[PDB]
Design a binder for this molecule. Sequence first.
Ligand SMILES: O=C(O)c1ccc2c(c1)OCO2
Ligand SMILES: O=C(O)c1ccc2c(c1)OCO2
Ligand SMILES: O=C(O)c1ccc2c(c1)OCO2
Lengths: 289, 281
Amino acid sequence: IPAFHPGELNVYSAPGDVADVSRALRLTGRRVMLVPTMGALHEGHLALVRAAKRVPGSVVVVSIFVNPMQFGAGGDLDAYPRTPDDDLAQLRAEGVEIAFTPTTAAMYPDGLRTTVQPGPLAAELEGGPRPTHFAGVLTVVLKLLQIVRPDRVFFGEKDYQQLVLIRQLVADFNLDVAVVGVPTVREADGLAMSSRNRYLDPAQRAAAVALSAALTAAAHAATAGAQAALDAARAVLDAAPGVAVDYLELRDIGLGPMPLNGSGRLLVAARLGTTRLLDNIAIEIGTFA
Amino acid sequence: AIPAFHPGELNVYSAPGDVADVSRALRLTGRRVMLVPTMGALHEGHLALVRAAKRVPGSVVVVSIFVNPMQFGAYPRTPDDDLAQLRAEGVEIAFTPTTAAMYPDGLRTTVQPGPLAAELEGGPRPTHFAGVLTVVLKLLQIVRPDRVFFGEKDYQQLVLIRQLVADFNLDVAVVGVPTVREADGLAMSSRNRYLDPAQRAAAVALSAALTAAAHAATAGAQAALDAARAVLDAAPGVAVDYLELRDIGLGPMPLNGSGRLLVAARLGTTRLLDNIAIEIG
Ligand SMILES: O=C(O)c1ccc2c(c1)OCO2
Ligand SMILES: O=C(O)c1ccc2c(c1)OCO2
Ligand SMILES: O=C(O)c1ccc2c(c1)OCO2
């Protein structure tokens, strides 16, 4: 058709359906907000939804799509958590009017043909041993932006490298959307929220606080300079039982071919058993506050 | 404050943000925005593009003029005459950005075309089509046209733009415009003036070969190919790079049905291309 029941959760699977409804809402003056997710929603996703909601006269579109193109072969794709019933229930509770739940076939009818090739940042940090990963992310986000044509698109600072790449996408392709980054939601001990946190047993869950503890220690130590920041983070991680650090890196905020001068981001990735966790924090070098 | 726009006059903007704002504002005033991407040095081929765009009711025509550095290997520039030609066509918007304005962060995020981009013209130039789809995407995003107009002359380019559009869910209609030709059939191109008289006379073999082939095709695909090959074989100094019959999307030619016959050839230093619709049987 498609029908749109205002004040209720409308679920569309067809790209054409959501595109038409979005086009219609935008033509009546409502401002279209997009929150792209892969489902398995937790409270940090709900913060994304809330921030979009607070935009005056917004209509909130939340996409749920476990994008196969951002996964490397092996079992990562099949192993991704799927909790559709909880996801949709959470969106209704939040007063979301639109959930977009496309099929793989609707998204990729010609498989991998035209795709987005990210800049050299895609080859680093998370992309190091996963060199097609961000091409996957950026290909899907580009499509979702073209399908929904939102005014603003909301991402978490949690997957900070991804946020940077998305701002690159938007800049480099002249996309008429505002990219809104939302501060990471944390458990009460500091643990960054993630759909991956379900894979930590009680021992791993206890040990996992070491990531955020290491980052906040570094952010405070940073008055004393970069080395002191990094060493404080390293000390905490080294004190933590069964935390296998992948990388701990201090970068310029754009993550790119510029040196760290003053304002930076400290990024960590670590393994707890088979569970790979990420966190990051703002760092100010020589700044007490 | 939206940049100044004067209806019925050629309005020239170099800033991507400016044409973006004027285009958006215009669409709201009840215009349909038509984009014709060019690399300048305009001839009758481009004018056919412009007239196609103009005839759409409520059209405002955006002609972009940008020599895309990214579609050249890992040139004519007539700005004044270009702009005067557009004025004579009643085109109201020219978009003439700089390389710096188009690539302000340099070459970073780009479009990776599909596997068709490595075939045919992507043989000699394996990065050419990445360069084209990247700039076309950017132009589409800047101008946000209802319809975008490309020639059938660069057929493989046109198919790849159709793939871009489907594959990225772009909200634009791609309009293919038939090749404008010289009096003897030679497909128009700024390259043609480079041919010496001997080459210019032999150059008519590309179109002749294709038209022969289209008419031979009632006897089937192999007759059509053999006919085309015969005409090219009658021409001196025409180095055929390829002659291929494909389906209209440039996949394999099916048993019968619509297809497209494509040819490329070097005459001295000048590469010429042509293509034609073929109906098999
Ligand atoms: O995608 C996430 O796992 C995530 C997790 C936490 C977030 C967030 C996103 O946005 C703001 O807080
Ligand atoms: O020139 C026209 O009369 C005309 C009228 C309607 C058209 C059109 C051309 O292109 C597609 O929609
Ligand atoms: O780009 C060209 O050289 C060209 C040449 C001929 C054309 C055309 C473009 O659009 C339709 O007819």
